[PDB]
Design an enzyme around this catalytic site. Sequence first.
Site, PDB file in Angstrom:
ATOM      1  N   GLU A  72       0.795  -1.220   0.000  1.00 35.65           N
ATOM      2  CA  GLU A  72       0.000   0.000   0.000  1.00 35.65           C
ATOM      3  C   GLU A  72       0.829   1.273   0.000  1.00 35.65           C
ATOM      4  O   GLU A  72       0.580   2.171  -0.779  1.00 35.65           O
ATOM      5  CB  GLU A  72      -0.958   0.051   1.198  1.00 35.65           C
ATOM      6  CG  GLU A  72      -2.086  -0.961   1.165  1.00 35.65           C
ATOM      7  CD  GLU A  72      -3.097  -0.736   0.048  1.00 35.65           C
ATOM      8  OE1 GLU A  72      -3.115   0.348  -0.570  1.00 35.65           O
ATOM      9  OE2 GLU A  72      -3.902  -1.653  -0.196  1.00 35.65           O
TER      10      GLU A  72
ATOM     11  N   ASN B 254      -7.752   9.814  -5.615  1.00 30.97           N
ATOM     12  CA  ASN B 254      -8.481   9.023  -6.601  1.00 30.97           C
ATOM     13  C   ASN B 254      -9.372   9.990  -7.363  1.00 30.97           C
ATOM     14  O   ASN B 254     -10.490  10.300  -6.934  1.00 30.97           O
ATOM     15  CB  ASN B 254      -9.323   7.952  -5.910  1.00 30.97           C
ATOM     16  CG  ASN B 254      -8.493   7.041  -5.032  1.00 30.97           C
ATOM     17  OD1 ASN B 254      -7.710   6.227  -5.533  1.00 30.97           O
ATOM     18  ND2 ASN B 254      -8.641   7.179  -3.713  1.00 30.97           N
TER      19      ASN B 254
ATOM     20  N   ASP C 283     -13.280   9.193  -7.931  1.00 28.21           N
ATOM     21  CA  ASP C 283     -14.384   9.429  -7.005  1.00 28.21           C
ATOM     22  C   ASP C 283     -14.157  10.542  -5.993  1.00 28.21           C
ATOM     23  O   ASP C 283     -14.930  10.680  -5.047  1.00 28.21           O
ATOM     24  CB  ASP C 283     -14.822   8.142  -6.294  1.00 28.21           C
ATOM     25  CG  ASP C 283     -13.854   7.698  -5.226  1.00 28.21           C
ATOM     26  OD1 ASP C 283     -12.727   8.213  -5.182  1.00 28.21           O
ATOM     27  OD2 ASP C 283     -14.223   6.821  -4.424  1.00 28.21           O
TER      28      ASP C 283
ATOM     29  N   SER D 226     -11.928  10.867  -3.627  1.00 31.34           N
ATOM     30  CA  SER D 226     -11.498  10.465  -2.290  1.00 31.34           C
ATOM     31  C   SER D 226      -9.965  10.337  -2.292  1.00 31.34           C
ATOM     32  O   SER D 226      -9.347  10.268  -3.354  1.00 31.34           O
ATOM     33  CB  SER D 226     -12.154   9.130  -1.894  1.00 31.34           C
ATOM     34  OG  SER D 226     -11.623   8.029  -2.619  1.00 31.34           O
TER      35      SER D 226
ATOM     36  N   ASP E  89      -6.533   8.312  -0.288  1.00 31.22           N
ATOM     37  CA  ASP E  89      -6.051   7.239   0.591  1.00 31.22           C
ATOM     38  C   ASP E  89      -4.877   7.828   1.373  1.00 31.22           C
ATOM     39  O   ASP E  89      -3.978   8.450   0.780  1.00 31.22           O
ATOM     40  CB  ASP E  89      -5.575   6.050  -0.236  1.00 31.22           C
ATOM     41  CG  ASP E  89      -6.646   5.520  -1.142  1.00 31.22           C
ATOM     42  OD1 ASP E  89      -7.756   5.272  -0.653  1.00 31.22           O
ATOM     43  OD2 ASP E  89      -6.389   5.379  -2.342  1.00 31.22           O
TER      44      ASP E  89
END
Length: 130
Positions: A35, A46, A49, A51, A53
């Site tokens: 990750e 992202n 959408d 959002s 991380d």
Amino acid sequence: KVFERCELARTLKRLGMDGYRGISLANWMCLAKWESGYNVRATNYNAGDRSTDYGIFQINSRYWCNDGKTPGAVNACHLSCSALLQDNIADAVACAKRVVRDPQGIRAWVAWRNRCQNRDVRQYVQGCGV
Ligand code: NA
């Protein structure tokens, strides 16, 4: 801060991650590795959408933490996403524990499915003393 493999392994063990909800320490290490590369400051937007991380486990702002700019988002961990960028990973660990408390468990992260599931993950903890 970018953790060294064994340093992180020992830190996660002390935070009670070994076997948490049936998830072995090596699985958590494989997840962090793929990750963020063990980098607590990793962030990935992202565009699809809206959002982002955040952190060592790349926790998403739509469901888990609040960054204020993600549409129709919830904050299940009740944390500012900023907390997931600290060198002290205690908050990120508490939030990761919450994420797997959901029915999908570790499968919530697609990367886990792609590179850890059904694989020999012993390599991530070997020689670390955990
Ligand atoms: Na959120």
